[PDB]
Each structure stands twice: as C-alpha cells, then as structure tokens.
Amino acid sequence: GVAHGLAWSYYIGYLRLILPELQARIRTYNQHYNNLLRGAVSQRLYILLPLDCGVPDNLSMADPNIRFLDKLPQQYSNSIYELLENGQRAGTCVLEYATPLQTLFAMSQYSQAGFSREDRLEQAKLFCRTLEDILADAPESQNNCRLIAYQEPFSLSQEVLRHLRQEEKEEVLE
Numbered sequence: 249g250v251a252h253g254l255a256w257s258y259y260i261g262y263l264r265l266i267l268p269e270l271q272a273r274i275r276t277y278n279q280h281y282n283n284l285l286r287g288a289v290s291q292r293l294y295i296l297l298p299l300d301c302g303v304p305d306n307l308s309m310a311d312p313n314i315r316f317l318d319k320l321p322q323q324y325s326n327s328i329y330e331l332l333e334n335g336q337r338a339g340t341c342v343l344e345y346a347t348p349l350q351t352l353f354a355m356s357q358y359s360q361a362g363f364s365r366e367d368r369l370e371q372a373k374l375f376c377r378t379l380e381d382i383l384a385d386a387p388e389s390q391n392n393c394r395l396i397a398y399q400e401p402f403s404l405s406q407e408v409l410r411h412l413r414q415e416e417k418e419e420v421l422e
C-alpha cells in the first residue's frame with residue numbers, strides 16, 4: 249500500500265521539521281494574543297485527516313465555525329483558527345489538512361492506477377494508523393501533534409473542540 253510511503257515522507261519531510269520549533273512559535277505568539285483580547289492558542293499542531301480524502305485546493309476551512317484568525321509568525325505557512333460555538337470563540341488552534349490525502353484522491357481519479365474509491369478509503373485509514381504509530385515512537389516531535397481523522401455520514405468544529413478540551417483536561421493533570 250502507498251500509505252506507508254506517504255506517511256513516512258510526510259513525517260520525515262515535513263512534520264519532523266516544523267514540530268520542534270512549533271511550541272516556541274506558539275508560546276511567542278501567546279505573549280501577544282493574551283494581552284490582545286484574552287485567548288490563548290493551543291500548543292499542539294492539529295492535523296485534519298478527512299478519510300474521504302476531500303482537501304480543498306486552497307487549503308481553507310469551509311466550516312463557518314472554523315474562522316481564520318491569524319498567520320503564526322516564523323521562528324513555513326501555519327494558520328491560527330478560532331473555533332466558534334454560537335458565534336462565540338470557544339477555542340483557538342493551529343490547524344491544517346494532511347496534504348498527502350490529496351495524493352490518494354488524485355490516484356483514485358487516475359484510471360491507470362487501478363485504485364478504487366474503496367482502495368482509497370483503506371489507504372487513508374492505513375495512512376492515519378501508520379502516521380499515528382510513527383508519531384508515537386518519535387521524540388519531541390511526538391507530543392505536540394494530534395491527528396483528527398473523521399468519516400462523514402457531523403460538525404468538524406465540534407470535533408476539533410472535543411480535542412482541544414481534552415488537551416486542556418490533560419494539561420491541568422500534572
């Protein structure tokens with residue numbers, strides 16, 4: 249399955265490289281988002297993994313409750329989103345799509361690949377599990393990346409908020 253190489257390439261070529269400085273980049277931004285308004289950005293990188301492999305070309309968040317707030321400054325392109333409930337801010341995080349799913353989607357439309365929609369879903373799930381396994385075995389790169397994988401029959405904003413609130417619960421325990 250292609251998912252093994254996709255997961256390793258994404259980790260080795262992207263996640264391994266941004267994650268070390270991410271906590272410092274967010275902590276530095278929180279030295280301003282605190283005094284300006286009163287929120288705080290979560291410290292983990294949240295990666296959206298829609299198992300139907302639907303990734304918007306412009307990489308934006310369609311959900312009106314996932315609202316672009318700011319670009320995160322350098323220490324490349326990482327966006328901070330506000331998660332809304334009833335039009336009010338309920339959380340703030342760095343959020344982006346797992347771009348290797350775009351490759352899986354394109355393979356499923358490339359008939360010479362012999363790669364069906366059923367094959368695509370299996371590889372998307374295997375990509376999630378492989379990347380989760382890599383991240384769990386990783387050093388500092390590990391502890392600050394969370395995969396949000398989902399299948400649709402659903403509120404994406406509520407699913408991200410579930411993860412953010414669980415991150416806070418774990419924070420206040422030791």
Ligand SMILES: [Ca+2]
Nearest residue numbers: 419420421422
């Ligand atoms: Ca505590």
